[PDB]
Design a protein around this ligand. Structure first.
Ligand code: PXJ
Ligand code: FE
Length: 288
């Protein structure tokens, strides 16, 4: 279990511990650079857009184009450190993609880690949202939003077929890899109750290498596809999965090859009030 975010009220600020370290963070930071696209969407959901002074515009999702106003701090894998310095932020918010540059970032300004725990998605998700909301006095609003998300989870959990199995896959160039429970997309199995065609897929950040022979041998009832091409600006998932083998699966037969929106699933990783809700609905609409 990843250490949670913990905070102590210091009057004009909070003293804040997370899994990478500790920071004094002002109440109401007014100049926040945000490198997690999920948190950006939480900032939008809580009407905190004017607090955001820089975003990774090379990877700004279509669903967050209201932020194309903001100065750019590069990409999520290509941080523009000079632009971050030059903006003189009072807070920087990162997740897993920037952990290795923690120290550089913290030299510049207080740097908060809001990564998701793959083994405890929901508790880490609520902890991230609330920790952010608490900086602004908005815990009440945030908890209401979270409670709405949980009604969706409970509903979605109910319309679930106990006898059908899913495979989660990610496509990239002409390469497929597999994800299962406890992975960066595990909410599908771990939270929404959809069974896994294969319980022993080793968790890895960009998945474990497979091919279409594997997909047909497993013969899942659903295939959830996350097309990383779209994120990288590349060809498409429909290409590599247009083959005779995939076409024979139960998932093809029953029109359950579901292309998940990668901006939400890959980039945001469901780490926001908006993305997570949309993602619950997407799965719910794709499986009923
Ligand atoms: O540490 C990470 N990546 C290091 C960069 C090595 C990846 C090579 C190419 N990646 C990309 O160009 C890329 C671009 C945008 C978003 C991404 O995730 C990407 O991997 C990382 C961490 C959590 C989740 C990810 O997914 C990551 O990668
Ligand atoms: Fe990546």
């Amino acid at each position: 279990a990843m250490l949670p975010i913990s905070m102590s009220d210091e009057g004009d600020s909070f003293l804040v511990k997370d899994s990478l370290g500790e920071n004094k963070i002002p109440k109401n930071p007014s100049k926040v650079v945000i490198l997690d696209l999920g948190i950006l969407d939480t900032f939008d959901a809580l009407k905190l857009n004017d607090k955001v002074v820089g975003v990774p515009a090379k990877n700004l999702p279509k669903y967050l184009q209201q932020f194309k106003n903001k100065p750019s701090v590069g990409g999520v894998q290509q941080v523009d450190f000079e632009a971050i310095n030059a903006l003189k932020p009072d807070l920087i918010i990162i997740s897993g993609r920037q952990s290795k540059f923690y120290d550089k970032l913290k030299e510049i300004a207080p740097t908060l880690f809001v990564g998701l725990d793959n083994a405890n998605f929901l508790s880490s998700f609520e902890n991230n949202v609330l920790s952010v909301a608490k900086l602004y006095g908005l815990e009440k609003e945030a908890l209401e939003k979270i409670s709405d998300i949980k009604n969706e989870i409970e509903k979605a959990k109910s319309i679930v077929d106990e006898d059908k199995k899913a495979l989660i896959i990610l496509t990239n160039s002409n390469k497929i890899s597999a994800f299962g429970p406890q992975s960066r997309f595990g909410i599908i199995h771990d939270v929404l109750g959809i069974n896994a065609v294969d319980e022993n897929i080793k968790v890895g950040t960009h998945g474990k290498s497979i091919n279409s022979e594997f997909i047909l041998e497993k013969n899942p009832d659903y295939i959830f596809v996350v097309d990383r091409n779209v994120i990288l600006g590349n060809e498409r998932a429909q290409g590599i999965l247009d083959n005779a083998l995939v076409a024979k699966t139960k998932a093809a037969q029953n029109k359950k090859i579901i292309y998940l929106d990668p901006e939400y699933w890959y980039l945001a990783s469901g780490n926001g009030l908006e993305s997570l809700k949309t993602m619950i609905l997407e799965i719910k609409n794709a499986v009923k």
